[PDB]
Amino acid sequence: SMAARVLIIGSGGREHTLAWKLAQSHHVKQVLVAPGNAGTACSEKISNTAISISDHTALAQFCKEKKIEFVVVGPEAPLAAGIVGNLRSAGVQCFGPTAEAAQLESSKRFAKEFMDRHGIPTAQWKAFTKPEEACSFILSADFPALVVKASGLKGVIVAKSKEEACKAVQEIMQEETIVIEELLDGEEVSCLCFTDGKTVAPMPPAQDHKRLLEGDGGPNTGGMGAYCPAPQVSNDLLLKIKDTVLQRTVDGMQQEGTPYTGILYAGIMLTKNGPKVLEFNCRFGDPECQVILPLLKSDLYEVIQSTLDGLLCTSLPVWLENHTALTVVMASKGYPGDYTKGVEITGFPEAQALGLEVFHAGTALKNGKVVTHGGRVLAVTAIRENLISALEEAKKGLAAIKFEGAIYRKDIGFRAIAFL
Ligand SMILES: Nc1ncnc2c1ncn2[C@@H]1O[C@H](COP(=O)(O)OP(=O)(O)OP(=O)(O)O)[C@@H](O)[C@H]1O
Ligand SMILES: [Cl-]
């Protein structure tokens, strides 16, 4: 099925990665990214479009006029806005869950209730709308009830003391419901799968670093780096997770008459008691996408097309084994607070020539130059035989790329390396 045109929604590194990867398919003549960035502007197959992504009527008309085969959604917002359901009733295929099914991410209360209803393991919890009753619960639990979550996508506060959790319940009920749950401990890992509603095809597990500074210090951010596969997870554990979380989530959704299709993301804590779910999401994470998709050997276009057709098992994904992908984000001075914009970037061509992938996040074209246009500017991904080697190879690319006030971490993966 040659000469397909495909559309991706979004404008960060995740969307560059999806575009790059799709463009490799022999089935694909054109990838359009809406609105895209400087990394996707100007390629043999990839280009940007200013089509509105929030007016679903106009988006559908644009899809049919250009004969777009299907739409791929990068970020979570359009999913929760109904993009899939609306494109479908207009006769346009879109990869992703419906708004109803994205409730696994969009409402934390729904997710926790859904999990209790189907014996999916997760931290014990309770929801509140009055803050006084929330304090009562914090103050009188014998387990550490110290994690407070704004139900509607601060958002999440992990307190160390009852005092801090009461303080937190106060801040989140300023500017619905909140969920207070047990503080678990152990290792966090991201477990994704492709799913068509019935079949489940897990991705190899990833980990990322949210903290701004080396050593895991400073403020949290959207993610300063990631790598895949996380060596902390045995094969047994992955099949426990596939059975106990992924297949069980999809089956549960299907059995409640709200089938789940696209990507299911589960954030998981490895406890002494086993795997527990911290949160669901409905799309690739950023910068994890930048380390999972480079590991995919199959044609992504085939995987997606077969997922839309409900024939996921006819085209199971095949992964690169014995390779580790690791990615390191370059960010603008001041991130995650106020940062500078419009700063000229050099060296990303030589970084790629060294055999690395450069995935653009906040970049833009300006007067024949590429300039910073966002907090996270780009990521360099290396694919090698182990973490340590991938890290050091990525760092050569990082040293070639220069912009005024660039920051990045030189220790991505340090814990996985210490685990081994
Ligand atoms: N139920 C849970 N048990 C334990 N950890 C959790 C739970 N749910 C979420 N988390 C994790 O807590 C992490 C964030 O907590 P962290 O220890 O970084 O403190 P923080 O709230 O981020 O503090 P800061 O004010 O510095 O941002 C997230 O990575 C999130 O996945
Ligand atoms: Cl919908």
CSV table of C-alpha atoms and ligand atoms in Angstrom, one decimal:
chain,number,residue,atom,x,y,z
A,1,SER,CA,0.0,0.0,0.0
A,2,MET,CA,2.5,2.7,-1.3
A,3,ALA,CA,2.4,6.5,-1.3
A,4,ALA,CA,0.3,7.0,1.9
A,5,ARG,CA,0.2,10.5,3.5
A,6,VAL,CA,0.0,10.6,7.3
A,7,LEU,CA,-0.6,13.4,9.8
A,8,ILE,CA,0.9,13.9,13.2
A,9,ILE,CA,-0.6,16.3,15.8
A,10,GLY,CA,1.9,18.2,18.0
A,11,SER,CA,5.1,20.2,18.0
A,12,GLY,CA,7.8,18.6,20.3
A,13,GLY,CA,10.5,15.9,20.2
A,14,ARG,CA,7.9,13.1,20.5
A,15,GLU,CA,6.4,14.4,17.3
A,16,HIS,CA,9.7,14.7,15.5
A,17,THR,CA,10.4,11.1,16.5
A,18,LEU,CA,7.1,9.8,15.2
A,19,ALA,CA,7.6,11.7,12.0
A,20,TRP,CA,11.2,10.4,11.5
A,21,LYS,CA,10.1,6.9,12.2
A,22,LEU,CA,7.0,6.9,9.9
A,23,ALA,CA,9.1,8.5,7.1
A,24,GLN,CA,11.3,5.3,7.0
A,25,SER,CA,8.3,3.3,5.9
A,26,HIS,CA,8.4,2.4,2.2
A,27,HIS,CA,4.6,2.7,2.4
A,28,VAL,CA,4.8,6.4,3.1
A,29,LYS,CA,5.2,9.3,0.7
A,30,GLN,CA,4.4,12.1,3.0
A,31,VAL,CA,4.3,13.0,6.7
A,32,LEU,CA,2.7,16.2,7.8
A,33,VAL,CA,3.1,17.5,11.4
A,34,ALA,CA,0.6,20.0,12.9
A,35,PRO,CA,2.2,22.5,13.7
A,36,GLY,CA,5.5,20.8,13.9
A,37,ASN,CA,8.8,22.5,14.5
A,38,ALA,CA,12.1,23.3,12.8
A,39,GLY,CA,13.2,19.7,12.8
A,40,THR,CA,10.1,18.7,10.8
A,41,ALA,CA,9.8,21.7,8.5
A,42,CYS,CA,11.9,20.8,5.6
A,43,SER,CA,12.7,17.3,4.7
A,44,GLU,CA,12.2,14.8,1.8
A,45,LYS,CA,9.0,13.4,3.3
A,46,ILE,CA,8.2,15.6,6.3
A,47,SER,CA,6.7,19.0,6.4
A,48,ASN,CA,4.6,21.2,8.7
A,49,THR,CA,1.0,22.5,8.4
A,50,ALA,CA,-0.9,25.2,10.2
A,51,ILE,CA,-4.2,23.3,10.1
A,52,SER,CA,-6.1,23.9,13.3
A,53,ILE,CA,-5.9,20.9,15.6
A,54,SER,CA,-8.6,22.1,18.0
A,55,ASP,CA,-11.4,22.7,15.3
A,56,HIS,CA,-12.1,19.0,14.5
A,57,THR,CA,-14.5,19.9,11.7
A,58,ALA,CA,-11.7,21.8,9.8
A,59,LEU,CA,-9.2,19.1,10.6
A,60,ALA,CA,-11.5,16.4,9.1
A,61,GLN,CA,-12.1,18.5,6.0
A,62,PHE,CA,-8.3,18.9,5.6
A,63,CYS,CA,-7.7,15.2,6.1
A,64,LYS,CA,-10.2,14.2,3.4
A,65,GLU,CA,-9.1,16.8,0.9
A,66,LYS,CA,-5.4,15.7,1.2
A,67,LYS,CA,-6.4,12.1,1.4
A,68,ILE,CA,-4.6,11.6,4.6
A,69,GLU,CA,-4.6,7.8,5.6
A,70,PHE,CA,-4.7,8.4,9.3
A,71,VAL,CA,-3.9,10.8,12.1
A,72,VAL,CA,-1.5,10.2,14.9
A,73,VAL,CA,-1.9,12.1,18.1
A,74,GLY,CA,1.3,13.2,19.9
A,75,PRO,CA,0.0,14.9,23.1
A,76,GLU,CA,-2.8,14.0,25.6
A,77,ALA,CA,-5.0,17.2,25.3
A,78,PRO,CA,-6.6,16.5,21.9
A,79,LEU,CA,-7.4,12.9,23.0
A,80,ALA,CA,-9.3,14.2,26.0
A,81,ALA,CA,-11.0,16.8,23.7
A,82,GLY,CA,-12.6,14.0,21.6
A,83,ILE,CA,-10.4,14.2,18.5
A,84,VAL,CA,-10.6,10.5,17.8
A,85,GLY,CA,-14.4,10.2,18.2
A,86,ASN,CA,-14.9,13.3,16.1
A,87,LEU,CA,-12.6,12.4,13.3
A,88,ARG,CA,-14.2,9.0,13.2
A,89,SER,CA,-17.7,10.2,12.8
A,90,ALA,CA,-16.4,12.3,10.0
A,91,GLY,CA,-14.9,9.2,8.3
A,92,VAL,CA,-11.3,9.9,9.2
A,93,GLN,CA,-9.1,7.3,10.9
A,94,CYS,CA,-7.2,8.5,13.9
A,95,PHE,CA,-4.8,6.5,16.1
A,96,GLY,CA,-5.6,6.9,19.7
A,97,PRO,CA,-8.2,6.3,22.4
A,98,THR,CA,-11.6,8.0,22.5
A,99,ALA,CA,-12.3,10.7,25.2
A,100,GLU,CA,-14.2,8.1,27.2
A,101,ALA,CA,-11.2,5.7,27.2
A,102,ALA,CA,-8.7,8.6,27.9
A,103,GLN,CA,-10.4,9.0,31.3
A,104,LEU,CA,-7.8,6.5,32.5
A,105,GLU,CA,-5.5,9.6,32.3
A,106,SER,CA,-7.9,12.5,32.4
A,107,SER,CA,-9.6,11.7,35.7
A,108,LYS,CA,-7.5,10.1,38.5
A,109,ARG,CA,-10.6,9.1,40.5
A,110,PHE,CA,-12.1,7.2,37.5
A,111,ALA,CA,-8.7,5.4,37.1
A,112,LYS,CA,-8.5,4.3,40.7
A,113,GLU,CA,-12.1,3.2,40.7
A,114,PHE,CA,-11.5,1.3,37.5
A,115,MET,CA,-8.5,-0.5,39.0
A,116,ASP,CA,-10.4,-1.6,42.1
A,117,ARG,CA,-13.2,-2.8,39.9
A,118,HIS,CA,-10.9,-5.1,38.0
A,119,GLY,CA,-8.3,-6.1,40.6
A,120,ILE,CA,-5.5,-4.2,38.9
A,121,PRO,CA,-2.8,-3.5,41.6
A,122,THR,CA,-2.4,0.1,42.6
A,123,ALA,CA,-1.8,2.1,45.9
A,124,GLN,CA,-4.8,2.2,48.3
A,125,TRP,CA,-6.5,5.5,48.2
A,126,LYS,CA,-9.5,7.6,48.8
A,127,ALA,CA,-11.0,10.7,47.1
A,128,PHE,CA,-12.4,13.9,48.6
A,129,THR,CA,-14.1,17.1,47.6
A,130,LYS,CA,-14.0,18.7,51.0
A,131,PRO,CA,-10.4,19.5,52.3
A,132,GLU,CA,-11.3,19.1,56.0
A,133,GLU,CA,-12.2,15.4,55.4
A,134,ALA,CA,-9.1,15.0,53.5
A,135,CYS,CA,-7.0,16.0,56.4
A,136,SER,CA,-8.9,13.7,58.8
A,137,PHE,CA,-7.9,10.9,56.4
A,138,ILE,CA,-4.3,12.0,56.3
A,139,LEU,CA,-4.1,12.4,60.0
A,140,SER,CA,-5.7,9.1,60.9
A,141,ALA,CA,-4.3,6.6,58.4
A,142,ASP,CA,-1.9,4.0,59.7
A,143,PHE,CA,-0.3,3.6,56.3
A,144,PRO,CA,1.7,6.6,54.8
A,145,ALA,CA,-1.2,8.4,53.1
A,146,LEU,CA,1.1,11.2,51.8
A,147,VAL,CA,0.6,11.5,48.1
A,148,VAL,CA,-2.0,14.0,47.0
A,149,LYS,CA,-3.3,14.2,43.5
A,150,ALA,CA,-5.4,16.8,41.7
A,151,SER,CA,-7.9,14.6,39.9
A,152,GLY,CA,-8.0,16.8,36.7
A,153,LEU,CA,-4.8,17.0,34.6
A,154,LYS,CA,0.8,21.4,40.7
A,155,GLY,CA,-1.1,18.2,40.0
A,156,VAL,CA,0.8,15.7,42.1
A,157,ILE,CA,2.5,16.3,45.5
A,158,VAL,CA,4.5,13.7,47.3
A,159,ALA,CA,4.8,14.8,50.9
A,160,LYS,CA,7.2,13.3,53.4
A,161,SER,CA,5.1,14.2,56.5
A,162,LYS,CA,1.5,14.4,57.5
A,163,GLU,CA,2.0,18.1,58.0
A,164,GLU,CA,3.2,18.5,54.4
A,165,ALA,CA,0.3,16.5,53.0
A,166,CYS,CA,-2.2,18.7,54.9
A,167,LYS,CA,-0.3,21.7,53.5
A,168,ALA,CA,-0.6,20.2,50.0
A,169,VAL,CA,-4.3,19.5,50.3
A,170,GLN,CA,-4.6,23.2,50.9
A,171,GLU,CA,-2.6,24.4,47.9
A,172,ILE,CA,-4.4,22.1,45.4
A,173,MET,CA,-7.8,23.3,46.6
A,174,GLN,CA,-7.0,26.9,45.5
A,175,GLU,CA,-5.9,27.1,41.9
A,176,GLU,CA,-13.7,18.6,41.3
A,177,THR,CA,-12.0,16.1,43.6
A,178,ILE,CA,-8.5,15.0,44.9
A,179,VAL,CA,-7.1,11.6,45.4
A,180,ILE,CA,-5.0,10.9,48.4
A,181,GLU,CA,-3.0,7.6,48.1
A,182,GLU,CA,-0.4,5.5,49.8
A,183,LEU,CA,3.3,6.5,49.3
A,184,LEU,CA,4.9,3.4,47.8
A,185,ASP,CA,8.6,2.9,47.4
A,186,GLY,CA,10.9,1.1,45.0
A,187,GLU,CA,11.8,1.7,41.3
A,188,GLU,CA,9.6,3.5,38.9
A,189,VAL,CA,9.3,2.3,35.2
A,190,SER,CA,7.2,3.2,32.2
A,191,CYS,CA,5.4,0.3,30.6
A,192,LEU,CA,3.8,1.0,27.3
A,193,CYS,CA,1.9,-1.1,24.8
A,194,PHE,CA,0.3,-0.9,21.4
A,195,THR,CA,-3.3,-2.1,21.7
A,196,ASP,CA,-6.2,-2.5,19.3
A,197,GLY,CA,-8.7,-3.1,22.0
A,198,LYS,CA,-8.2,-6.9,22.2
A,199,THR,CA,-4.5,-7.7,21.4
A,200,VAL,CA,-1.8,-6.2,23.6
A,201,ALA,CA,1.8,-5.6,22.3
A,202,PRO,CA,4.0,-4.4,25.1
A,203,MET,CA,6.9,-2.0,24.5
A,204,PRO,CA,10.2,-2.7,26.3
A,205,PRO,CA,10.2,-0.7,29.7
A,206,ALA,CA,11.7,2.8,29.9
A,207,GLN,CA,12.8,5.2,32.6
A,208,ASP,CA,13.4,8.9,32.5
A,209,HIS,CA,14.9,11.7,34.7
A,210,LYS,CA,12.6,14.6,35.7
A,211,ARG,CA,15.1,16.5,37.9
A,212,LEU,CA,16.9,19.4,36.3
A,213,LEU,CA,20.4,18.9,37.9
A,214,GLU,CA,23.1,16.2,37.9
A,215,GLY,CA,22.6,13.9,40.9
A,216,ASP,CA,18.8,14.2,40.6
A,217,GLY,CA,18.8,17.7,42.3
A,218,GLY,CA,16.9,20.9,41.6
A,219,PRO,CA,13.3,21.4,40.4
A,220,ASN,CA,11.3,18.8,38.5
A,221,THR,CA,10.9,19.4,34.7
A,222,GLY,CA,9.2,17.6,31.8
A,223,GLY,CA,12.1,15.2,31.6
A,224,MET,CA,15.8,15.8,31.0
A,225,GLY,CA,16.6,12.4,29.6
A,226,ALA,CA,15.6,8.8,29.2
A,227,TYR,CA,16.7,5.3,28.2
A,228,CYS,CA,15.3,2.0,27.2
A,229,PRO,CA,15.1,-0.9,28.1
A,230,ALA,CA,15.3,-0.4,31.9
A,231,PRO,CA,17.5,-3.3,33.1
A,232,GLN,CA,15.7,-3.3,36.5
A,233,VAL,CA,12.9,-5.4,35.0
A,234,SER,CA,13.2,-9.2,34.6
A,235,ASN,CA,11.2,-11.0,31.8
A,236,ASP,CA,9.0,-12.6,34.4
A,237,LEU,CA,8.2,-9.2,35.8
A,238,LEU,CA,7.3,-7.9,32.3
A,239,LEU,CA,4.9,-10.8,31.8
A,240,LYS,CA,3.4,-10.2,35.2
A,241,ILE,CA,2.9,-6.6,34.2
A,242,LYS,CA,1.5,-7.5,30.8
A,243,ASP,CA,-1.0,-9.8,32.4
A,244,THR,CA,-1.8,-7.9,35.7
A,245,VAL,CA,-1.9,-4.4,34.2
A,246,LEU,CA,-1.9,-4.0,30.4
A,247,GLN,CA,-4.1,-6.9,29.2
A,248,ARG,CA,-6.3,-6.5,32.3
A,249,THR,CA,-6.8,-2.8,31.7
A,250,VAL,CA,-7.8,-3.3,28.1
A,251,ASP,CA,-10.1,-6.3,28.9
A,252,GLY,CA,-11.6,-4.3,31.7
A,253,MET,CA,-12.3,-1.3,29.4
A,254,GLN,CA,-13.7,-3.6,26.7
A,255,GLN,CA,-15.9,-5.3,29.2
A,256,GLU,CA,-17.3,-2.0,30.3
A,257,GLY,CA,-18.3,-1.1,26.7
A,258,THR,CA,-15.6,1.6,26.3
A,259,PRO,CA,-12.9,-0.2,24.3
A,260,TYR,CA,-9.3,1.2,24.5
A,261,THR,CA,-7.2,1.6,21.3
A,262,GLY,CA,-3.8,3.1,20.5
A,263,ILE,CA,-1.1,3.4,23.1
A,264,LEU,CA,-1.7,2.6,26.8
A,265,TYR,CA,1.0,4.0,29.1
A,266,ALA,CA,1.3,2.6,32.6
A,267,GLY,CA,3.6,4.2,35.2
A,268,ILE,CA,4.7,1.5,37.5
A,269,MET,CA,6.3,1.2,41.0
A,270,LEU,CA,8.2,-2.0,41.7
A,271,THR,CA,7.3,-2.7,45.3
A,272,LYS,CA,8.4,-5.4,47.7
A,273,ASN,CA,4.8,-6.5,47.1
A,274,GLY,CA,5.2,-6.4,43.3
A,275,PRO,CA,4.1,-4.1,40.5
A,276,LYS,CA,1.7,-1.3,41.3
A,277,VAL,CA,0.2,1.4,39.0
A,278,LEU,CA,1.0,5.0,39.8
A,279,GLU,CA,-0.8,6.5,36.7
A,280,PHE,CA,-2.1,5.8,33.2
A,281,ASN,CA,-1.5,7.9,30.2
A,282,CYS,CA,-2.7,7.6,26.6
A,283,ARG,CA,0.3,8.5,24.3
A,284,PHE,CA,4.1,8.3,24.3
A,285,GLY,CA,6.0,10.3,27.0
A,286,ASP,CA,8.5,12.9,26.1
A,287,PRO,CA,11.5,12.2,26.0
A,288,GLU,CA,10.8,8.4,26.3
A,289,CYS,CA,9.5,8.3,22.8
A,290,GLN,CA,13.0,9.4,21.7
A,291,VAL,CA,14.3,6.1,23.2
A,292,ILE,CA,11.5,3.6,22.5
A,293,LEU,CA,10.9,4.1,18.8
A,294,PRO,CA,14.5,4.0,17.8
A,295,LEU,CA,14.3,0.4,19.2
A,296,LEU,CA,11.4,-0.6,17.0
A,297,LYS,CA,12.6,-2.8,14.1
A,298,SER,CA,9.1,-3.1,12.4
A,299,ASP,CA,7.5,-0.6,10.2
A,300,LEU,CA,5.5,1.8,12.5
A,301,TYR,CA,3.1,2.5,9.6
A,302,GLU,CA,2.2,-1.2,9.5
A,303,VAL,CA,1.8,-1.4,13.3
A,304,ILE,CA,-0.6,1.6,13.4
A,305,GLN,CA,-2.6,0.6,10.2
A,306,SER,CA,-3.1,-2.9,11.7
A,307,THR,CA,-4.1,-1.4,15.0
A,308,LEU,CA,-6.8,0.7,13.4
A,309,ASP,CA,-8.1,-2.3,11.5
A,310,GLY,CA,-8.2,-4.4,14.7
A,311,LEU,CA,-5.7,-6.8,13.4
A,312,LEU,CA,-2.8,-5.9,15.7
A,313,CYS,CA,-1.8,-9.6,16.1
A,314,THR,CA,-1.3,-9.8,12.3
A,315,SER,CA,1.6,-7.3,12.7
A,316,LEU,CA,3.2,-7.7,16.1
A,317,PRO,CA,6.0,-5.3,16.7
A,318,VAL,CA,9.6,-6.6,16.6
A,319,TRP,CA,12.2,-4.9,18.9
A,320,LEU,CA,16.0,-4.4,18.7
A,321,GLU,CA,17.5,-6.7,21.3
A,322,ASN,CA,20.9,-6.3,22.9
A,323,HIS,CA,20.8,-2.5,22.2
A,324,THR,CA,20.2,0.3,24.6
A,325,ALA,CA,18.8,3.7,23.5
A,326,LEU,CA,19.6,6.7,25.7
A,327,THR,CA,18.6,10.3,25.1
A,328,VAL,CA,19.7,13.6,26.6
A,329,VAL,CA,17.7,16.8,26.5
A,330,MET,CA,19.2,20.2,25.9
A,331,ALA,CA,17.3,22.9,27.6
A,332,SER,CA,17.3,26.7,27.6
A,333,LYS,CA,18.9,28.7,30.4
A,334,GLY,CA,16.2,29.3,33.2
A,335,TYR,CA,14.1,26.2,32.4
A,336,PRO,CA,11.8,25.1,34.1
A,337,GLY,CA,11.1,28.7,35.0
A,338,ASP,CA,11.5,31.7,32.7
A,339,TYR,CA,13.9,31.1,29.8
A,340,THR,CA,15.4,32.9,26.9
A,341,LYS,CA,14.0,32.4,23.3
A,342,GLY,CA,15.3,33.1,19.8
A,343,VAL,CA,18.9,32.0,20.4
A,344,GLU,CA,20.8,30.6,17.5
A,345,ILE,CA,21.7,26.9,17.5
A,346,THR,CA,24.7,25.3,15.8
A,347,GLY,CA,26.3,21.8,15.5
A,348,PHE,CA,23.2,19.7,15.3
A,349,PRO,CA,24.2,18.6,11.7
A,350,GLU,CA,27.7,17.3,12.9
A,351,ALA,CA,26.0,15.6,15.9
A,352,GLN,CA,23.8,13.6,13.5
A,353,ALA,CA,26.8,12.9,11.1
A,354,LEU,CA,28.5,11.3,14.1
A,355,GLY,CA,25.6,8.6,14.0
A,356,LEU,CA,23.2,10.0,16.6
A,357,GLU,CA,19.6,11.1,16.2
A,358,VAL,CA,18.8,14.7,16.9
A,359,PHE,CA,15.1,15.2,17.8
A,360,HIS,CA,14.0,18.8,17.9
A,361,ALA,CA,11.6,20.0,20.6
A,362,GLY,CA,11.4,23.8,21.0
A,363,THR,CA,13.1,24.9,17.8
A,364,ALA,CA,12.0,27.3,15.0
A,365,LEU,CA,13.2,28.7,11.7
A,366,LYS,CA,14.1,32.4,11.7
A,367,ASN,CA,15.9,34.2,8.9
A,368,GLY,CA,17.7,31.2,7.5
A,369,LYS,CA,18.8,30.1,11.1
A,370,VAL,CA,17.5,27.5,13.6
A,371,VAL,CA,16.8,29.1,16.9
A,372,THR,CA,15.5,28.0,20.4
A,373,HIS,CA,11.8,28.3,20.8
A,374,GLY,CA,10.9,26.6,24.1
A,375,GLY,CA,12.2,25.3,27.4
A,376,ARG,CA,13.3,21.9,26.1
A,377,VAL,CA,15.2,22.5,22.9
A,378,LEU,CA,16.2,19.1,21.5
A,379,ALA,CA,17.4,15.7,22.5
A,380,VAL,CA,20.3,13.6,21.3
A,381,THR,CA,19.7,9.9,21.1
A,382,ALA,CA,22.4,7.2,20.9
A,383,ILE,CA,21.7,3.5,20.2
A,384,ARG,CA,24.5,1.2,21.4
A,385,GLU,CA,25.1,-2.1,23.1
A,386,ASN,CA,24.8,-1.0,26.7
A,387,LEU,CA,23.9,2.2,28.8
A,388,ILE,CA,27.4,3.3,29.5
A,389,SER,CA,28.4,3.3,25.8
A,390,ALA,CA,25.2,4.9,24.7
A,391,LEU,CA,25.7,7.7,27.2
A,392,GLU,CA,29.2,8.5,26.2
A,393,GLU,CA,28.3,8.4,22.5
A,394,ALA,CA,25.4,10.8,23.1
A,395,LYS,CA,27.8,13.1,24.9
A,396,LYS,CA,29.9,13.6,21.8
A,397,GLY,CA,26.8,14.9,20.0
A,398,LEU,CA,25.9,17.1,23.0
A,399,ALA,CA,29.4,18.7,22.8
A,400,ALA,CA,29.1,19.5,19.1
A,401,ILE,CA,25.8,21.3,19.6
A,402,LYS,CA,25.9,24.9,20.9
A,403,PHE,CA,23.6,27.6,21.8
A,404,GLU,CA,23.9,30.4,24.3
A,405,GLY,CA,22.9,29.2,27.8
A,406,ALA,CA,22.3,25.6,26.8
A,407,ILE,CA,22.0,23.2,29.8
A,408,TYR,CA,21.9,19.5,29.9
A,409,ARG,CA,22.8,16.6,32.2
A,410,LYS,CA,25.9,14.5,31.7
A,411,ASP,CA,24.7,11.6,34.0
A,412,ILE,CA,21.5,10.3,32.4
A,413,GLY,CA,21.1,6.7,33.3
A,414,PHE,CA,23.4,6.9,36.3
A,415,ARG,CA,21.1,4.7,38.5
A,416,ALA,CA,20.6,2.0,35.9
A,417,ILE,CA,24.3,1.8,35.6
A,418,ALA,CA,24.7,1.6,39.3
A,419,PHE,CA,22.0,-1.1,39.4
A,420,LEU,CA,23.9,-3.5,37.1
B,1,LIG,N1,1.6,6.4,44.9
B,1,LIG,C1,2.9,6.8,44.8
B,1,LIG,N2,3.8,6.4,45.6
B,1,LIG,C2,5.1,6.8,45.5
B,1,LIG,N3,5.6,7.6,44.6
B,1,LIG,C3,4.7,8.1,43.7
B,1,LIG,C4,3.3,7.8,43.7
B,1,LIG,N4,2.6,8.4,42.7
B,1,LIG,C5,3.5,9.1,42.1
B,1,LIG,N5,4.8,9.0,42.6
B,1,LIG,C6,6.0,9.6,42.1
B,1,LIG,O1,6.6,10.7,42.9
B,1,LIG,C7,7.5,11.3,42.0
B,1,LIG,C8,7.6,12.8,42.4
B,1,LIG,O2,8.0,12.8,43.7
B,1,LIG,P1,9.4,13.4,44.2
B,1,LIG,O3,10.0,12.4,45.2
B,1,LIG,O4,10.1,13.9,43.0
B,1,LIG,O5,8.9,14.7,45.1
B,1,LIG,P2,8.1,16.0,44.4
B,1,LIG,O6,6.6,16.0,44.8
B,1,LIG,O7,8.4,15.9,42.9
B,1,LIG,O8,8.9,17.3,45.1
B,1,LIG,P3,9.2,18.7,44.4
B,1,LIG,O9,8.5,19.7,45.3
B,1,LIG,O10,10.7,18.9,44.6
B,1,LIG,O11,8.8,18.6,43.0
B,1,LIG,C9,6.9,11.2,40.6
B,1,LIG,O12,8.0,10.6,39.8
B,1,LIG,C10,5.7,10.2,40.8
B,1,LIG,O13,5.7,9.2,39.8
B,2,CL,CL,-14.1,10.7,21.4
